[PDB]
DNA sequence: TGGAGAATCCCGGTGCCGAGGCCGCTCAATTGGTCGTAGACAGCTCTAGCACCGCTTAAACGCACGTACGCGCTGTCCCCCGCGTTTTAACCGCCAAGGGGACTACTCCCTAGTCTCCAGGCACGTGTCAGATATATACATCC
DNA sequence: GGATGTATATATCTGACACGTGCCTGGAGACTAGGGAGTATCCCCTTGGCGGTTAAAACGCGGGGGACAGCGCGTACGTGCGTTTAAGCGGTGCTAGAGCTGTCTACGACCAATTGAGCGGCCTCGGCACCGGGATTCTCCA
């Protein structure tokens, strides 16, 4: 079975590293970036949907991000998703 | 001369527009209202007339459910009339 | 401002499709707030819908899925 | 003969795995077709979600002296903040409590 | 060949099996797609046609109408409380709401 | 593309001598539109949770089930066996 | 001695909006849950973590319908809840 | 049978308490064991339509998580 | 309680536009065969679920008392409803510019598919640190 | 101003979090192939303006009824205390059945040819909206 938890534990520490998690805690992390990742990427899928389209791209999800998330949440999700697609397409 | 008592007139209007499948607000002012909230959003933009019709129709059901359960509020607190604490106390049970 | 072309006559006859009887003077303000946060938060979406498929012009078709996205479905313009 | 194996999350700077989002948005049955950017963007999305919920979460465990969060931490970093509680609305935390809300009509005077 | 006979007609249907096959399978729901399920799924929805569609017109006929009006397809899915609980997030476009005035406004 | 001609079929089948006008039939269209949706979205939800790739008839009569209430369940769980027993044996 | 009538229910508030606990004890949830269960299907079996899934919705539910419960007394100028309050609220956001 | 009894006075309290409730009338607590008992039947129809599709004759935790996903009451911490 | 007047219901005539039927035709459903794989079926294992028993103890239950509070009644005065009059601008019809949505062709680049392989991630095991608990002192509320 | 609920500080236990290690399997590199979509005139239709007209909205005035504050009362919850009872924990026993694996076979994807069903267009007549007259509730006042 497939958890988050060592990554959801990175951040974890990259954002306080003398601090931990229980196990319930990473349990509900779990769910919440699945929740996430359902809502985004449903959204995405209606919205290749609807524009007659048979991919789904980074406009896609970033749509999506704006259709879901509130306003400075999307703001800034929108910003660090348009900053990792351009150092993938920078790095080869 | 004739005077109707206060209540006769508003429960008449009351049957009328249940009756009645008409949109209420007018047409135009909701369109230059549509306008002016999408000019802050996004400049130069263009619109259907079915897309107004669209908005005005489930703002229309949106308000008409909202002051029906403004008017349960009120007389929850033995009154009839309503006042902002009926819609406040409807849109903090809804989850608005 | 053009949300006083909301006018009082018609928050009076929303009302009274509601079931209203009686109305307190200071309901109309509340009511034109209540129908911009509404209004802004569809026309958002839609305005959302259309940026995405590249047009100028807000269809029909956007209104009826910003409002299926929070659940206020509409019969009658497609789908 | 092959190059060095690197990871698409490193090429990204994220630490959410790229590779796995791909994996679950193909087989997922979401559209035909996926593209090579759309599991970065939404692994740096999903990625910087956890980091506001983890911040706010570590904030709420510090504050009450302790370095584990625990769910009632959690419930603390969602519903104290307006725009997570706006993203979960309908979203119950097991274990996770309720904030403390006194009405002003019931405490004494 | 033989004689062209319609999925419909054999599965004693007016709903198309085809079209609800050809949607199932475009529609990105699953990779393989049986051969029940769009003449179940045909079967439902032409049920629930039927069932808005025979209070639509009961609704009609009260009314003095021949034909219905979006009123009718209101006053039938709303007085139905199946109907209603199915319905209950749809705003039907030129429907209008019920008759209902509550007993604190009436006169005494 | 619309669900016109076959809502008219069921119509006349139920009242024959009651017609219908072009936004009822846009409305009904839409109604046929979103419960086929609703149903479809389950069926696809409930085959990804129990590791199935394929949409049977039993998938589409469990999401009847979960979706629709009672009286109208159990009614529309009635019509989809006996038109997939009509189907199956002719 | 004896307290005035009400500061222990503030104290009550005060420590249990602290607490994370179960407040439904769980041997008689089980019961209700297989009481509940056995009008749809005959012999069933229950994990402990589906049952305990069910009472933490079912707390939270009931929780949630308090608060709106007590600000729709508080709406009504009281300090007391009553049936009437719990079926507006469920009128409101559509249960009922 | 007769088991919403069980779910106690005190409970009812406990949970009223917790909701920010300062007094209680004594007919609150057959509303709420209707309104639990509607709910509770809701939630476990669907979690044993979950079970029954899936030629289980054991209600498993998912089974919950998915029912309660279908009304919009969504819980974590189980796996959802 | 009767009567004046206002609103509403019923009946008939008229015109209109939209629903309903007919027809060409094209395109999507049907038919028949093939092929590979998803899933039904049998079996086995060992995991977790159910049933039962003892005990000890936290919590539920029953009862008594009294006081806070729900609720009915009364007065008052203000705010909203009803209605007539005047202003305003919405609505309908008509007419142009012109921006922009929809269709089509092509060509290219992006993404599915496959083989190979190796390193990231998962399962398992272990020590060790963070809460939980227990008790004395003193600070913060309660009446 | 005397009586309780709880911060606050020091010791100990324990079990669950975190780190180390080994296999394994799924992601990554490299290559190819083919099809999705990105980019380059035309008619619908959206916006902008003018004129008339007339329905609706704004405004002012009177008054009446309803919101709201105060007050009394009677009762029904809150709180506290003593008795009971069954939840909870620990342990044992056993047996259904969840979950995994192997086999094979039926069934659905897929392709090619055929053909009729449904869709766009067009024409027609009848259901319904509307206007006018007159009878039937229906509300308010003396």
Known sequence: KESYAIYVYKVLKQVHPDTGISSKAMSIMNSF???????????????????????????????????????????????????????????? | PHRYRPGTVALREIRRYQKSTELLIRKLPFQRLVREIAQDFKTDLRFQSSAVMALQEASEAYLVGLFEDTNL????????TIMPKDIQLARRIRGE | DNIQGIT???????????????????IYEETRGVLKVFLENVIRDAVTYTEHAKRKTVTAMDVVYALKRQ??????FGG | ?????????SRAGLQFPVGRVHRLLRKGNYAERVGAGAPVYLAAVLEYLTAEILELAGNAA???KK??????????????????????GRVTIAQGGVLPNIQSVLLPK
């Not at chain 1, 290749?48 to 970033?62: L, M, W």
């Open chain 1, 33 to 92: 970036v699945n929740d996430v990742f359902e809502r985004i990427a449903g959204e995405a899928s209606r919205l290749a949907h609807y524009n007659k389209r048979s991919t789904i791209t980074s406009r896609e999800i970033q749509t999506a991000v704006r259709l879901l998330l509130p306003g400075e949440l999307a703001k800034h999700a929108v910003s660090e998703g348009t900053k990792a697609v351009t150092k993938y397409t920078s790095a080869k």
């Open chain 2, 73 to 80: 509020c009120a007389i929850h607190a033995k009154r009839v």
């Open chain 3, 8 to 26: 009082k006559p018609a928050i009076r006859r929303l009302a009274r499709r509601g079931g209203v009887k009686r109305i307190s003077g200071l």
């Open chain 3, 71 to 76: 659940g206020r479905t509409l019969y009658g």
């Open chain 4, 1 to 9: 003969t092959r190059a060095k194996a690197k990871t698409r999350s």
């Open chain 4, 62 to 64: 510090r504050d009450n």
């Open chain 4, 67 to 88: 370095t584990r969060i625990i769910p009632r931490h959690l419930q603390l970093a969602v519903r104290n903040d307006e725009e997570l509680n706006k993203l979960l």
